Amino acid sequence: KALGIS
Amino acid sequence: KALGIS
Amino acid sequence: KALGIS
Amino acid sequence: KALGIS
Amino acid sequence: KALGIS
Amino acid sequence: KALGIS
Amino acid sequence: KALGIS
Amino acid sequence: KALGIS
Amino acid sequence: KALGIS
Amino acid sequence: KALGIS
Amino acid sequence: KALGIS
Amino acid sequence: KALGIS
Amino acid sequence: KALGIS
Amino acid sequence: KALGIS
Amino acid sequence: KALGIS
Amino acid sequence: KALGIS
Amino acid sequence: KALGIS
Amino acid sequence: KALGIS
Amino acid sequence: KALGIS
Amino acid sequence: KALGIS
Numbered sequence: 001k002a003l004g005i006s
Numbered sequence: 007k008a009l010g011i012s
Numbered sequence: 013k014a015l016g017i018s
Numbered sequence: 019k020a021l022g023i024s
Numbered sequence: 025k026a027l028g029i030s
Numbered sequence: 031k032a033l034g035i036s
Numbered sequence: 037k038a039l040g041i042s
Numbered sequence: 043k044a045l046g047i048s
Numbered sequence: 049k050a051l052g053i054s
Numbered sequence: 055k056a057l058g059i060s
Numbered sequence: 061k062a063l064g065i066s
Numbered sequence: 067k068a069l070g071i072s
Numbered sequence: 073k074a075l076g077i078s
Numbered sequence: 079k080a081l082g083i084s
Numbered sequence: 085k086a087l088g089i090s
Numbered sequence: 091k092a093l094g095i096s
Numbered sequence: 097k098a099l100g101i102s
Numbered sequence: 103k104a105l106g107i108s
Numbered sequence: 109k110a111l112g113i114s
Numbered sequence: 115k116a117l118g119i120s
Contacts, residue, residue: 042045
């Protein structure tokens with residue numbers, strides 16, 4: 001799974 | 007912040 | 013399952 | 019915040 | 025089951 | 031908030 | 037089942 | 043908000 | 049926010 | 055399932 | 061922010 | 067799955 | 073910032 | 079800062 | 085997976 | 091997995 | 097700064 | 103500073 | 109994987 | 115893995 005935070 | 011986990 | 017938070 | 023889990 | 029909160 | 035669970 | 041919230 | 047689940 | 053889960 | 059939040 | 065997970 | 071945040 | 077993960 | 083992990 | 089941050 | 095921080 | 101990882 | 107690890 | 113930072 | 119810091 002990938003993770004992104006603005 | 008926005009946050010997403012695929 | 014994927015997770016999103018605005 | 020809005021939140022979704024698929 | 026999926027979950028959504030506005 | 032509105033909330034739904036499929 | 038799909039879920040939508042305006 | 044309006045809400046629908048198919 | 050609007051939210052959809054397919 | 056896909057997830058979208060405006 | 062808008063957020064999508066395919 | 068792909069992830070996008072505006 | 074915008075963020076994407078393919 | 080924005081942060082992503084693929 | 086590829087990662088991009090504006 | 092790759093890591094990026096703006 | 098913008099950042100990309102292929 | 104921005105930081106990336108491939 | 110390649111890395112670029114503006 | 116490669117490392118870059120602006």
